[PDB]
């Protein structure tokens, strides 16, 4: 009734409280429950939002490139990438003392600096870069593209440029353009980049923009592509002793498929990735021609899903009516996209610590763990968001009339069975994992390590033996010689793979001890429990047995009242709350496992892991209590050093964690009375009753309370673990 | 030889661990006279420790580079060898005992659904009925399979759901 | 404010009114068995949303459900 | 004369009811005429602790 | 500070029990109730029982701080062995320039004095480390209750009961989740149990190896 | 005949407290209650302590509406006494609320017509389809 900030809430405007401020800062991106937000006026806003967020990403990358070019020692890294370490940015903080300027001066060419853990030097030099000007250029380019997207987001807002509604429902042509253009064409351009610049830079050649107009990337240039015999491009690869900054034993091959590692740089051959991305681009181009268009016949979607119907009725209607269901719902596509993005983020994190694509990258021992944990938590949050939007689908966009007989209704019908079996697998994993850990702890406490249980992971070791591993001796595929899998592909990628697999020093199919069994089962427990929480919050969304009409109160509501014996945290948003707690736990267990595995591996004492990864006292002593001495000694009366800021941030993380507990344990009602008391006191202070607050102070909403509590929880968890992973690694180097 | 592991007798680390344990025991065993009680206690402890280390190394159990025993849990690797007792038969023993327990509990909770106020029977049990059913479940695999073919365990979809 | 509804599932027990702390709902004609009353929400400017009327309603499923809406001075129980 | 015989047990089909698909005896089918004539009585409690409820005659069905 | 905050919690629970500014009809609701309703933005932990709930946590905090102060003072500036020339304490007087910083409590007291509790498996003090880890476990276990509700748990019990009724093995007594008040009670119980047990194991395994 | 508010009414004997009577009561609203109270007696205040009450109709006033419904219900509890309510806005306009029927909303009065209700079984509501408007919280019939 009373108009004020914001512009998109008439009910929250009459609200005489600071609550409307928080709900405006929160619901500013919820562009579906606002007043008068019909469909066709929403796609253009979300599209401008895509432009804005892309501009943010490009401006981020531009700032990174700029601080690398001007404040980073990229010149000091290319020449001798082993004797030097990266630098991120400088410091103009007046709060530092004289010892502080002397402690943050690892470089020596400037004042206080900070190490660069982004891993950008390796990825920028593998693609070919040996000058800071080449970095300034890219930074300016990214700033320009950010501005371009900021403008393009606005251009489609005024008429004569506003799109229509039928332009979005045409999923066929858009998916064609994305599979072919967004993936295939860009991949082929990337192959061109690798073959015209990255390779010449690997030969120490200073080949860039000013000279590629006549440089033949291959003798008999482009003629084999005209006159057949493609094999002519894979006849002289990089020599085993190839230098990457110079041309010490170089080659003229561009499309190589030897499938190995570049010994000096310790990464995949710079020429393998060219043929890699070329095959990827060809295959994505083949994929991008599947659909019906204006004049391209292909085959449309409505006739495919309605044809996938098992005749025996195992599914019923099969997939009839799902085209109109998915195409008319954005939360379902968002759930699918976030699920795929999270799973492929985990996949990329798995593939980056095992198949290094970047030259001079595996030698660095700090950016690896940082980037891996980065992508792990990113994938965890993206998966939790995928499940959250999957529940929002059932809550907000669902029409069971159209869905009378599809697989989604069937899935909703036996939801109790799914939830019960998730609960059962979780119970099994938890019971047995905790039981074996407690057993090993009690057995070690009695001083008889022989009496512990150590299940030998025969399955993963068997799969490794099939990969080419011989440490286990199972006489399997790619390990024996009486099989077609070992014979075929002998001049192919097999030699490099088999040579890199039996190496007991690189991270590629590590020697698996029984201590990996227990931790993989703990990870399975964490995954099954998080998935239980999410699937339960999602399936019991339209209506549960306690709250049948749950579809009426939306998605994020505090509770349904203290009636019926107690109803707390019953909304699906609260299940998402708890599932984010479990996501933090699961990703933390995964990161502890990976970190301590590679930590026992880097000290040359993998037997330490193979012997102490069997019980919990080892995890507490050999990992947590042990590898933290530089965190405690970052600053002391003796004098601080470069590791002081990281220790103070390690404490900041714990402070944020405890504030999260503050907002989690104590709930709202308690604080309303205290706020009313403080208001009483503030209105009666003598001569302090001048110009008043503009909005009434009240206690944070219960939903808001738990949201901010989980936000503090997550952010403190992340900062603490990251400060640890960075300090306890980039301070000792061992 | 499986998984790069070696039989646990040829493990130098295993024997080194046994010697370490025995030295650690004897260093504080030498604190007491051969007649007192603590001395006899440590003697018996050393007895069954030596028995631990001797009795394990029979029929074959693999110890790894750490010298500690490692259980093989795959059926097929426990076969074609002698490891069927590591975890293959314990699985069936637990399955038998867990069946037994669930069978007895289910038949109890079913036979109580017929009388008035069954809730009482869940806080004040029928001790003689529980004892009778406790001594009748050690044929449950026979009763379970044929009670499944019977159909007296499938409820014909007459329960409370929400969907 | 708080959108309150009353469905036909009702017996007229007169309990959700002698339990409401803000005297929000009334009970006027209904054709029942022994008491013959039905609840109704004529006014909502003072309803805070405490869901005390939903606890005493013995109807299965409940006859009244408070659709949580927007807050105000009355809806936030603010003496200031 | 309208609803099932009194003392005869019957099940429930109210989609939103705690008691669903399980049987319960009828207290007294309201013969005076009303939209929810059948008053069914259940021994086990609900989330609220109530034992009885009245339902429509188009919802209840026969015995198991 | 901690004692005043605890007294604040307890007294604000005692006074606002017969009446208050928000809900005048507060005496009829009793002493042991979780809330009144999600009205007026939300009412949670308003009863004096909940104020005692929070006062238990604050008493834990205060008593823990005081006992750590006692232990570390006694071990730094009091206790030790006397040689021919003066007394050589347990710690090298680490109390002076470590208590002035929060990191000091983790620099020379918590990190340093925790070697025995995690290094006692080789001796008769391994039970102290076992209680140590178990108390950590039960503490986080209490966190479980403290951060969750009943709706999720009640619906999970619903699906589990579905799984039961398919084989006709469910109980005659209606299996309901714990009450909100009992949920908070279990939370605080496990929380104080884990905390006090961990601190007990620490102070009792550290002090045996230094006396 | 619903009685309207009358100023200059005496008050019960009481010392004071620290509940209510804030800036809200001056510029937004304040609520009033009046009731018989024969046989001068002792009562309890919802935002204070114990007080005495003369015989004959006496009037009180508080900040929140529940602060007076509590007293009305109390009066139900012990001895049959029949108070009333009043509203006040900024313009001084007064509105009578409880009991409008005069028979305590828990009991029907001869005849009226209520709103905010629909004759539909519990549940069986509309799915989110065709509910894109969403009109805040839908009455489902308007
Ligand atoms: C030899 C004859 C044969 C066989 C064996 C099959 C078999 C199959 N057909 Mg087919 N079909 C046949 C003849 C046959 N067809 C003929 C002659 C025609 C006409 C030409 C068709 C036309 C046809 C069509 C159009 C389609 C099929 C489809 C299918 C598949 C789905 C059927 C189904 O009910 O899924 C099983 C239903 C289930 C509910 C299985 C449940 C799976 C559980 C829940 C997974 C558990 C998850 C858990 C976490 C994982 C743990 C794993 C654990 C078990 C270890 C299936 C594998 C459909 C298909 O491709 O899939 C969509 C379909 O589109 N058929
Ligand atoms: C260390 C703290 C802790 C612990 C131990 C657990 C444990 C558990 N959680 Mg949980 N959780 C926690 C913290 C914790 N949580 C926190 C802080 C949150 C956010 C507030 C959550 C949120 C959460 C959700 C949303 C869910 C769980 C679930 C579960 C259960 C999964 C069952 C399982 O996987 O197998 C077994 C796990 C065990 C822990 C069993 C070990 C306990 C042993 C047997 C104790 C035995 C004691 C001994 C026999 C006698 C002692 C009794 C008496 C004498 C004192 C499990 C019991 C899920 C669930 O309920 O499963 C269906 C569920 O969905 N949790
Ligand atoms: C991409 C995001 C990003 C972020 C997070 C930062 C962050 C920072 N920049 Mg930077 N900057 C960026 C982009 C970014 N910049 C880009 C794209 C350019 C090119 C125009 C610059 C050019 C730039 C210069 C020239 C300087 C900084 C400086 C700084 C630091 C202090 C800023 C200050 O106090 O001066 C004023 C803040 C105005 C908002 C700070 C940590 C200053 C510094 O101290 O270097 C570390 C400084 O000298 N920036
Ligand atoms: C407000 C202060 C501030 C600002 C604006 C930045 C900004 C930036 N930092 Mg940085 N950082 C800071 C404080 C800050 N940092 C402090 C106090 C430390 C501990 C000494 C670090 C340690 C640090 C490292 C190790 C790295 C960065 C990096 C970066 C850049 C990548 C984006 C990022 O990581 O976000 C900010 C990060 C935390 C807030 C970015 C421009 C990365 C880089 O190299 O840039 C390319 C990198 O690897 N920072
Ligand atoms: C070869 C043609 C082509 C190409 C290269 C792209 C490329 C792209 N489109 Mg696009 N699109 C196309 C044709 C194409 N489109 C056509 C013909 C239509 C009409 C149906 C659309 C409609 C469309 C929409 C509605 C949106 C995009 C979006 C996007 C961007 C996805 C976000 C991202 O970072 O990419 C991928 C990152 C890593 C692989 C991306 C750069 C999204 C966007 O970001 O907005 C700009 C988006 O919202 N496109
Ligand atoms: C978008 C990707 C891309 C682009 C824009 C180019 C562009 C170009 N290429 Mg090239 N090429 C590519 C991918 C690409 N290539 C890939 C993936 C391979 C590996 C098979 C090759 C292998 C190749 C050879 C062998 C030669 C070229 C040559 C050329 C130049 C002239 C020949 C011509 O294209 O007509 C031209 C500027 C010719 C040249 O003179 O180089 C400058 C030439 O000799 N290309
Ligand atoms: C260079 C070889 C080549 C050839 C022969 C074709 C041929 C064809 N394309 Mg295609 N296309 C190509 C490359 C090619 N394309 C590349 C490199 C891209 C990525 C930019 C595309 C992206 C593309 C799209 C988005 C579409 C086509 C479509 C079509 C068909 C429409 C013409 C028609 O109706 O038939 C007479 C046609 C058969 C249309 C189609 O059939 O849908 C798949 C369609 O809409 N193409
Ligand atoms: C998910 C359960 C599981 C898994 C992962 C494995 C896995 C494995 N089994 Mg096994 N097995 C299982 C269940 C399982 N088994 C069960 C239940 C039985 C009882 C019937 C067996 C009986 C069995 C035997 C007798 C053998 C294996 C063998 C093997 C290994 C080689 C596979 C093979 O048999 O040759 C190829 C598979 C072609 C389909 C392999 C690692 C073999 C082995 O010991 O490796 C040398 C072997 O001879 N298994
Ligand atoms: C909530 C929800 C949602 C979401 C969902 C999700 C999240 C999903 C997912 C998922 C996932 C995440 C998945 C994954 C997976 C996996 C797979 C599917 C696999 C496989 C297989 C294969 C076939 C393979 C093979 C191979 C090869 C090829 C070679 C080598 C070896 C291997 C084995 C690897 C939605 C919205 C939708 C709806 C609503 C609800
Ligand atoms: C202390 C506390 C309060 C009261 C806390 C208050 C009133 C502080 C919040 C407002 C002040 C002004 C915060 C000051 C600024 C913040 C530190 C950050 C604000 C930054 C934003 C602008 C992004 C609650 O309302 C509450 C509600 C539910 C559960 C637990 C609690 C709880 O623990
Ligand atoms: C799990 C959980 C529950 C569920 C709690 C349960 C189910 C406790 C039940 C466990 C007991 C120990 C079951 C044991 C009873 C056995 C069936 C019989 C005893 C065994 C004999 C041998 C004695 C809550 O009620 C709750 C409430 C508020 C916040 C969080 C939570 C919460 O997290
Ligand atoms: S409490 Fe419920 S059943 Fe009773 S009269 Fe009110 S609406 Fe009807
Ligand atoms: C495929 As072959 C080398 O076994 O004939
Ligand atoms: Ca290897």
From TrEMBL, chain A:
<feature type="binding site">
    <location>
        <position position="670"/>
    </location>
    <ligand>
        <name>chlorophyll a 70</name>
    </ligand>
</feature>
<feature type="binding site">
    <location>
        <position position="118"/>
    </location>
    <ligand>
        <name>chlorophyll a 19</name>
    </ligand>
</feature>
<feature type="binding site">
    <location>
        <position position="568"/>
    </location>
    <ligand>
        <name>[4Fe-4S] cluster</name>
    </ligand>
</feature>
<feature type="binding site">
    <location>
        <position position="95"/>
    </location>
    <ligand>
        <name>chlorophyll a 13</name>
    </ligand>
</feature>
<feature type="binding site">
    <location>
        <position position="421"/>
    </location>
    <ligand>
        <name>chlorophyll a 54</name>
    </ligand>
</feature>
<dbReference type="InterPro" id="IPR020586">
    <property type="entry name" value="PSI_PsaA/B_CS"/>
</dbReference>
<feature type="binding site">
    <location>
        <position position="173"/>
    </location>
    <ligand>
        <name>chlorophyll a 28</name>
    </ligand>
</feature>
<feature type="binding site">
    <location>
        <position position="196"/>
    </location>
    <ligand>
        <name>chlorophyll a 35</name>
    </ligand>
</feature>
<feature type="binding site">
    <location>
        <position position="350"/>
    </location>
    <ligand>
        <name>chlorophyll a 48</name>
    </ligand>
</feature>
<feature type="binding site">
    <location>
        <position position="95"/>
    </location>
    <ligand>
        <name>chlorophyll a 16</name>
    </ligand>
</feature>
<feature type="transmembrane region" description="Helical">
    <location>
        <begin position="575"/>
        <end position="596"/>
    </location>
</feature>
<keyword id="KW-0472">Membrane</keyword>
<feature type="binding site">
    <location>
        <position position="289"/>
    </location>
    <ligand>
        <name>chlorophyll a 41</name>
    </ligand>
</feature>
<dbReference type="GO" id="GO:0009535">
    <property type="term" value="C:chloroplast thylakoid membrane"/>
</dbReference>
<feature type="binding site">
    <location>
        <position position="521"/>
    </location>
    <ligand>
        <name>chlorophyll a 61</name>
    </ligand>
</feature>
TrEMBL record, chain C:
<keyword id="KW-0472">Membrane</keyword>
<dbReference type="InterPro" id="IPR050157">
    <property type="entry name" value="PSI_iron-sulfur_center"/>
</dbReference>
<feature type="binding site">
    <location>
        <position position="53"/>
    </location>
    <ligand>
        <name>[4Fe-4S] cluster 2</name>
    </ligand>
</feature>
<dbReference type="GO" id="GO:0016491">
    <property type="term" value="F:oxidoreductase activity"/>
</dbReference>
<dbReference type="GO" id="GO:0009535">
    <property type="term" value="C:chloroplast thylakoid membrane"/>
</dbReference>
<feature type="domain" description="4Fe-4S ferredoxin-type">
    <location>
        <begin position="38"/>
        <end position="67"/>
    </location>
</feature>
<keyword id="KW-0411">Iron-sulfur</keyword>
<dbReference type="GO" id="GO:0051539">
    <property type="term" value="F:4 iron, 4 sulfur cluster binding"/>
</dbReference>
<keyword id="KW-0934">Plastid</keyword>
<feature type="binding site">
    <location>
        <position position="47"/>
    </location>
    <ligand>
        <name>[4Fe-4S] cluster 2</name>
    </ligand>
</feature>
<keyword id="KW-0560">Oxidoreductase</keyword>
<feature type="binding site">
    <location>
        <position position="16"/>
    </location>
    <ligand>
        <name>[4Fe-4S] cluster 1</name>
    </ligand>
</feature>
<dbReference type="GO" id="GO:0046872">
    <property type="term" value="F:metal ion binding"/>
</dbReference>
<feature type="binding site">
    <location>
        <position position="10"/>
    </location>
    <ligand>
        <name>[4Fe-4S] cluster 1</name>
    </ligand>
</feature>
<feature type="domain" description="4Fe-4S ferredoxin-type">
    <location>
        <begin position="1"/>
        <end position="30"/>
    </location>
</feature>
From TrEMBL, chain E:
<feature type="transmembrane region" description="Helical">
    <location>
        <begin position="188"/>
        <end position="209"/>
    </location>
</feature>
<comment type="subunit">
    <text>The PsaA/B heterodimer binds the P700 chlorophyll special pair and subsequent electron acceptors. PSI consists of a core antenna complex that captures photons, and an electron transfer chain that converts photonic excitation into a charge separation. The eukaryotic PSI reaction center is composed of at least 11 subunits.</text>
</comment>
<feature type="binding site">
    <location>
        <position position="200"/>
    </location>
    <ligand>
        <name>chlorophyll a 15</name>
    </ligand>
</feature>
<feature type="binding site">
    <location>
        <position position="44"/>
    </location>
    <ligand>
        <name>[4Fe-4S] cluster</name>
    </ligand>
</feature>
<feature type="binding site">
    <location>
        <position position="152"/>
    </location>
    <ligand>
        <name>chlorophyll a 62</name>
    </ligand>
</feature>
<feature type="binding site">
    <location>
        <position position="32"/>
    </location>
    <ligand>
        <name>chlorophyll a 9</name>
    </ligand>
</feature>
<feature type="binding site">
    <location>
        <position position="35"/>
    </location>
    <ligand>
        <name>[4Fe-4S] cluster</name>
    </ligand>
</feature>
<feature type="binding site">
    <location>
        <position position="190"/>
    </location>
    <ligand>
        <name>chlorophyll a 61</name>
    </ligand>
</feature>
<feature type="binding site">
    <location>
        <position position="4"/>
    </location>
    <ligand>
        <name>chlorophyll a 60</name>
    </ligand>
</feature>
<feature type="binding site">
    <location>
        <position position="152"/>
    </location>
    <ligand>
        <name>chlorophyll a A3</name>
    </ligand>
</feature>
<comment type="similarity">
    <text>Belongs to the PsaA/PsaB family.</text>
</comment>
<comment type="function">
    <text>PsaA and PsaB bind P700, the primary electron donor of photosystem I (PSI), as well as the electron acceptors A0, A1 and FX. PSI is a plastocyanin/cytochrome c6-ferredoxin oxidoreductase, converting photonic excitation into a charge separation, which transfers an electron from the donor P700 chlorophyll pair to the spectroscopically characterized acceptors A0, A1, FX, FA and FB in turn. Oxidized P700 is reduced on the lumenal side of the thylakoid membrane by plastocyanin or cytochrome c6.</text>
</comment>
<feature type="binding site">
    <location>
        <position position="35"/>
    </location>
    <ligand>
        <name>[4Fe-4S] cluster</name>
    </ligand>
</feature>
<feature type="binding site" description="axial binding residue">
    <location>
        <position position="144"/>
    </location>
    <ligand>
        <name>chlorophyll a A3</name>
    </ligand>
</feature>
<feature type="binding site" description="axial binding residue">
    <location>
        <position position="136"/>
    </location>
    <ligand>
        <name>chlorophyll a'</name>
    </ligand>
</feature>
